[PDB]
Every structure is written in structure tokens, then in C-alpha cells.
């Protein structure tokens, strides 16, 4: 079954990528691996693991138990077709082909799933099969195969309302939009946090709360923050159990600038250790820095540079080198003075910066259509 | 129930005259808007900072 | 066709821009600030 | 109905449909609850009771 199957891949992340931390992960990952009939997905994880020399009989008892379920399917296919129900061969392996999806690889999954997709004439089985293809599409990071069955999925929810098949689906598109660096779409798929449920992949609902707040704090501005995440009783009481994230969120809201970096190292360090945020923990906090800089810096014009050390975060030369790479990076709209020791600001009208992205997209699409135009007709 | 809502009404009505007297000019000193609201300068300074934030 | 005579012989770009501005800078800030609370 | 319709060689099978019990009032709420935009935490069992 595929319901605990995300924790498996997250613990594969926990095995592989922390190099020093690879002992208890290969203990509990084996504790789940050489039981529940798992055969295929851990030979190269055994290569990244140690030798584990005598795994032969361990593989033999489980390819034997796998052979038992295979041969009782082979005892089912001929009794099912003698006096037929609703194609009871594909009705048996429409449920045990997910067992073959976990135990076997994606092939015996896929031919049986696209096989049984034509059996049920209503979407009450079809759309769950497509949910299963989505979930393995995450597992093998099938970034092209998810694009198919997302649209093929969404093509079924219009008949009916199917909000346990649409709001549940929005969790999949939200985890894809935070798998990629699409944060404004990730929180927008994470907009509700009401119909979202005590899930299987986030068995803590509060972990989903932490994810939607970590993406929302970038994703929306103060108006949205001073209405949306501050007045929700459904969002306040779940981080009422959180001492850290409640302080980490409110320190930016209550303008508690110096303590914000303290929990910023905590949440960023946890984000470094975390699966699925490990691609972008480096990009996250450098957005958080320039956001926290611009929020304070667009208040004053005559604010000096040696004010931010004691009130905002210590290290005057650290603020120096940190703002120099941001004005020099082309954002953080201000202009710093040095030897009279004051930071100046400016204001750009949306006439140049709004134009810059236009010449970017124009050069991008011109590269696209010129490249295609060189490809076709020799 | 009135004793609950008078503070939240007092914030909105604080800002309602606050946007009223800030209207007619381009620049002014904070000591005059403290004088014309007849209120202090630190709380008015932080409260004005809350508006531009 | 395609012989090309030989003279000698997302997931990837945004965090690479963080490798551009953020290559060898800070990298492990957890203790420099706690070492700056007493100096600053 | 008719006794000529109640000739035993006439009708092949007669099937009774009872009103639903507490178990079968729940699943019609389950299938029927699909197209609604819900709120998490409902306890449909109490509603069926």
C-alpha cells in the first residue's frame, strides 16, 4: 500500500544525504525494508549502505512471499473469468496492483493501472488510481508524468463537486509547487487549511501548518498577513501548540527585529535538515533577509547604518557586506552613504523595474522562437 | 459588551482623525500633529510608523 | 549526417544563483551572532 | 397486486428493499457528502444516529 510510502522516501533522504547521520536511518529503514515484502527499491540503497553480506535468504523468503501473492493472483484470474463479475481479474489486481506497485516497480503498477482504468465506468475508482499514479509520480520524481495525470485527474472532478477529490488534490499540487520553487502558487494551493485533513503524508496536521506558514510568510504581504494568518482561529490555535513558529512568525509581525534572526537560524537549520526543503533552504532565507531589510528600510529615509546593529542585528560590517551585495544585487531599493554614516533610501516608480522583466521575457521568448525556427525546416 | 469594543473602536477612530489632520500638507513636524491631536509624540511616532509599514 | 569533426576529443538554476551570490559567505551562521553579542 | 401476477411460475425473483439501518444510513451520507465543501471534523456517525 502507498499510504505510508512517502515516509520511506523521506527516510531514504535521511539515509543518503546526511553523511555522518546514516546509522539509525539504515537501521529503521531496514526495519521497514526487509519486511512488508519490499524487494526492488533498496538494492542501490544497499549499495549506498554497507555490505550486508547475507541478504540472500532475506531476499529469498520475500521473493517467495511475493511469489505467493503472485500465484494466488494466478489462482484468481481463472476462477474470476469462469462466472464473471465486473471483470473480477482486474477487480482483484485493481486492489492488489497497488500491492504490486509498492512491492514491484512501476511497470506492474502501470500496465495494471492503465489496464484497470478502462474497467470502472465511473471515476470513483479511476480518480483514485490516478491519485496513485500521482503519488508514485512524486516517488520517482516523474516530473513529466505528473503533468499528464494532473490534467487527466482534474478533468474528472467537474462532474460532481468531489471536494475530497479536489481539496485533497490541491495538497498534491501544493506539494508540487513547493517541490519546485513556486511559492506564491504553493501557498495559494495551501490557501484553505480548513478542508485539509489529518493526512497520511503529513500525519501531523501541524506539519502542514508549518509548511503553509513558511511558504506564506514569503508569499504574501502585510495586508494579507494582517488579515489572513493573524485572524484565523483555525490557524492560531494550531500554532498555539508551537512555541517556536508562533514566535518566529510574530517577531516579524510585532517588529521584533533582533530576536527574529535567532529563530531564523533555528527554522533555517531545520529547513537544511528537512526533506523537500533541502533544494531551496539556501534560497529561502536570502529572501527572508531582504524582505526583513526592505520592511524596516522603507519606513525611514534618514536612518543611519549604526542603528541596525543594536536594534536589528549585531555586526555593523556584517550589515555593510550584507546590504552591499543586495543593492549591488539590484534589489533593496535604497542608496547607502558611508563616511557620514547614514543609509539613504529612494523610491522607484514602477516604470523601470516593471520594464526590466518585460525585456527579460522578451529575450526569453525570442530565444525560444528563434531556436525553434532554426530547428524546423532544417 | 461595550467595554470590550471601545478600545478597538478607539483604534479605528484614532486612525480616522489621524488620516484627517495629516491631509492638508506635504510635510510637517511631529510636534504639531501631536499638538493638534493633543497627544504625545512617541506613541504617535510608532503609530504613524505602523501606517507606513 | 551529424559527424561534426572533432578538434579535441528547474531544480538547478535558482539555488545556483544562491551559489553565485552565496558561494563562500557565512555558510554556517549559528555561532557568529552569539560571538557578536559580547563584541557588539 | 394481482394473484395472477402471484402465480408462482410467473415471477422469477422478488427482492425486498428495507429502510436503512445505522450502518446503511452512514454510507449514503458518505457518497452524498462528496460534492459538498466540508469542514474538517464532522463525526458523520452521530448525524446518521
UniProtKB/Swiss-Prot annotation, chain A:
Give all residue intervals belonging to the PCI domain: 182-350
Q: Fetch the SMART domains from UniProt.
A: PINT (SM00088)
Instruction: Report the InterPro entries cross-referenced here.
Output: PCI_dom, Rpn7/CSN1, Rpn7_N, RPN7_PSMD6_C, TPR-like_helical_dom_sf, WH_DNA-bd_sf
Quaternary organization: Component of the 19S proteasome regulatory particle complex. The 26S proteasome consists of a 20S core particle (CP) and two 19S regulatory subunits (RP). The regulatory particle is made of a lid composed of 9 subunits including PSMD6, a base containing 6 ATPases and few additional components.
Q: Which GO terms describe its biological process?
A: proteasome-mediated ubiquitin-dependent protein catabolic process
Q: Which GO terms describe its cellular component?
A: cytosol; extracellular region; ficolin-1-rich granule lumen; nucleoplasm; proteasome accessory complex; proteasome complex; proteasome regulatory particle; secretory granule lumen
Phylogenetic placement of the source organism: Eukaryota, Metazoa, Chordata, Craniata, Vertebrata
| Purpose of the protein | Component of the 26S proteasome, a multiprotein complex involved in the ATP-dependent degradation of ubiquitinated proteins. This complex plays a key role in the maintenance of protein homeostasis by removing misfolded or damaged proteins, which could impair cellular functions, and by removing proteins whose functions are no longer required. Therefore, the proteasome participates in numerous cellular processes, including cell cycle progression, apoptosis, or DNA damage repair.
The disulfide bridges present are: none
Identify its protein family: Belongs to the proteasome subunit S10 family.
Under the heading Gene3D superfamilies, the entry gives: 1.25.40.570
Which gene codes for it?
PSMD6
Q: Does the record carry Ribosomal protein as a key word?
A: no
Designated name of the protein: 26S proteasome non-ATPase regulatory subunit 6
Keyword annotations for this protein?
A: Proteasome
UniProt xrefs under PANTHER family:
26S PROTEASOME NON-ATPASE REGULATORY SUBUNIT 6 (PTHR14145:SF1), 26S PROTESOME SUBUNIT 6 (PTHR14145)
UniProtKB/Swiss-Prot annotation, chain B:
Provide the disulphide bond pattern. Answer: none
Expressed, tissue-wise, as follows: Highly expressed in embryonic stem cells (ESCs). Expression decreases as ESCs differentiate.
Quaternary data: Component of the 19S proteasome regulatory particle complex. The 26S proteasome consists of a 20S core particle (CP) and two 19S regulatory subunits (RP). The regulatory particle is made of a lid composed of 9 subunits including PSMD11, a base containing 6 ATPases and few additional components.
Part of the intact protein present: 318 to 370 of 422
Which family does the record claim for this protein? Answer: Belongs to the proteasome subunit S9 family.
Q: How is it modified after translation?
A: Phosphorylated by AMPK.
User: What induces the gene encoding this protein?
Assistant: By FOXO4; expression in embryonic stem cells (ESCs) is mediated by FOXO4.
Q: Per its record, how is this protein called by name?
A: 26S proteasome non-ATPase regulatory subunit 11
Q: Where is this protein localized, as stated in its record?
A: Nucleus; Cytoplasm, Cytosol
Instruction: Explain the purpose of this protein.
Output: Component of the 26S proteasome, a multiprotein complex involved in the ATP-dependent degradation of ubiquitinated proteins. This complex plays a key role in the maintenance of protein homeostasis by removing misfolded or damaged proteins, which could impair cellular functions, and by removing proteins whose functions are no longer required. Therefore, the proteasome participates in numerous cellular processes, including cell cycle progression, apoptosis, or DNA damage repair. In the complex, PSMD11 is required for proteasome assembly.
From Swiss-Prot, chain C:
This protein's superkingdom? Eukaryota
Keyword annotations of the record: Nucleus, Proteasome
The record's subcellular locations are: Nucleus
Record-linked CDD domains: DSS1_Sem1
Q: Which GO terms describe its cellular component?
A: cytosol; integrator complex; nucleoplasm; proteasome complex; proteasome regulatory particle, lid subcomplex; protein-containing complex
The protein's matches in InterPro entries, at most eight in alphabetical order, are given as: DSS1_SEM1 (IPR007834)
- As annotated in Swiss-Prot or TrEMBL, what is the tissue specificity of this protein? Expressed in limb bud, craniofacial primordia and skin.
In its keyword annotation, does this UniProt entry include Nucleus? yes
Which processes are annotated in GO (biological process)?
double-strand break repair via homologous recombination; mRNA export from nucleus; proteasome assembly; proteasome-mediated ubiquitin-dependent protein catabolic process
Q: What Pfam families does its record include? A: DSS1_SEM1
Name the protein family: Belongs to the DSS1/SEM1 family.
Question: What do we know about how this protein assembles, alone or with others?
Answer: Component of the 19S proteasome regulatory particle complex. The 26S proteasome consists of a 20S core particle (CP) and two 19S regulatory subunits (RP). The regulatory particle is made of a lid composed of 9 subunits including SEM1, a base containing 6 ATPases and few additional components. Belongs to the TREX-2 complex (transcription and export complex 2), composed of at least ENY2, GANP, PCID2, SEM1, and either centrin CETN2 or CETN3. Component of the homologous recombination repair (HR) complex composed of ERCC5/XPG, BRCA2, PALB2, DSS1 and RAD51. Interacts with the C-terminal of BRCA2.
The entry's protein name is 26S proteasome complex subunit SEM1
Q: Which organism is it from?
A: Homo sapiens
Q: Which gene encodes it?
A: SEM1
Amino acid at each position: 500500500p502507498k499510504n505510508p510510502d512517502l515516509r520511506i522516501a523521506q527516510l531514504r533522504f535521511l539515509l543518503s544525504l546526511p553523511e555522518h547521520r546514516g546509522d539509525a536511518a539504515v537501521r529503521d529503514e531496514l526495519m521497514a525494508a526487509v519486511r512488508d515484502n519490499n524487494m526492488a527499491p533498496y538494492y542501490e540503497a544497499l549499495c549506498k549502505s554497507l555490505d550486508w553480506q547475507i541478504d540472500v535468504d532475506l531476499l529469498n523468503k520475500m521473493k517467495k512471499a511475493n511469489e505467493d501473492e503472485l500465484k494466488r493472483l494466478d489462482e484468481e484470474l481463472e476462477d474470476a473469468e469462469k462466472n464473471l463479475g465486473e471483470s473480477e481479474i482486474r477487480d482483484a489486481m485493481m486492489a492488489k496492483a497497488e500491492y504490486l506497485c509498492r512491492i514491484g516497480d512501476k511497470e506492474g503498477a502501470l500496465t495494471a493501472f492503465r489496464k484497470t482504468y478502462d474497467k470502472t465506468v465511473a471515476l470513483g475508482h479511476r480518480l483514485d488510481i490516478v491519485f496513485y499514479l500521482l503519488r508514485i509520480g512524486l516517488f520517482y520524481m516523474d516530473n513529466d508524468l505528473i503533468t499528464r495525470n494532473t490534467e487527466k485527474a482534474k478533468s474528472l472532478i467537474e462532474e460532481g463537486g468531489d471536494w475530497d477529490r479536489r481539496n485533497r488534490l490541491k495538497v498534491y499540487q501544493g506539494l508540487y509547487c513547493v517541490a519546485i520553487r513556486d511559492f506564491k502558487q504553493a501557498a495559494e494551493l495551501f490557501l484553505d487549511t480548513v478542508s485539509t485533513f489529518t493526512s497520511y503524508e503529513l500525519m501531523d496536521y501541524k506539519t502542514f501548518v508549518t509548511y503553509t506558514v513558511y511558504v506564506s510568510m514569503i508569499a504574501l504581504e502585510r495586508p494579507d498577513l494582517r488579515e489572513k494568518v493573524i485572524k484565523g482561529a483555525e490557524i492560531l490555535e494550531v500554532l498555539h501548540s508551537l512555541p517556536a513558529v508562533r514566535q518566529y512568525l510574530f517577531s516579524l509581525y510585532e517588529c521584533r527585529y533582533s530576536v527574529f534572526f535567532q529563530s531564523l537560524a533555528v527554522v533555517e537549520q531545520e529547513m537544511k535538515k528537512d526533506w523537500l526543503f533541502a533544494p531551496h533552504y539556501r534560497y529561502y532565507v536570502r529572501e527572508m533577509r531582504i524582505h526583513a531589510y526592505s520592511q524596516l528600510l522603507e519606513s525611514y529615509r534618514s536612518l543611519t547604518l549604526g542603528y541596525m546593529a543594536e536594534a536589528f542585528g549585531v555586526g555593523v560590517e556584517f550589515i555593510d557586506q550584507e546590504l552591499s551585495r543586495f543593492i549591488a544585487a539590484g534589489r533593496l531599493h535604497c542608496k547607502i552613504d558611508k563616511v557620514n554614516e547614514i543609509v539613504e533610501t529612494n523610491r522607484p516608480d514602477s516604470k523601470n523595474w516593471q520594464y526590466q522583466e518585460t525585456i527579460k521575457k522578451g529575450d526569453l521568448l525570442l530565444n525560444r522562437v528563434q531556436k525553434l525556427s532554426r530547428v524546423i525546416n532544417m | 459588551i461595550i467595554s470590550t469594543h471601545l478600545a478597538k473602536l478607539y483604534d479605528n477612530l484614532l486612525e480616522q482623525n489621524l488620516i484627517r489632520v495629516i491631509e492638508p500638507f506635504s510635510r510637517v513636524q511631529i510636534e504639531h500633529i501631536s499638538s493638534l491631536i493633543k497627544l504625545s509624540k512617541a506613541d504617535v511616532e510608532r503609530k504613524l510608523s505602523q501606517m507606513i509599514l | 549526417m551529424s559527424e561534426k569533426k572533432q578538434p579535441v576529443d528547474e531544480d538547478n538554476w535558482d539555488d545556483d544563483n544562491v551559489e553565485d551570490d552565496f558561494s563562500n559567505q557565512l555558510r554556517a551562521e549559528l555561532e557568529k551572532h552569539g560571538y557578536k553579542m559580547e563584541t557588539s | 397486486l394481482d394473484s395472477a401476477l402471484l402465480r408462482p411460475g410467473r415471477i422469477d425473483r422478488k427482492i425486498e428493499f428495507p429502510p436503512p439501518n445505522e450502518e446503511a444510513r452512514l454510507d449514503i451520507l458518505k457518497i452524498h457528502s462528496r460534492k459538498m465543501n466540508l469542514t474538517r471534523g464532522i463525526n458523520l456517525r452521530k448525524i446518521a444516529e
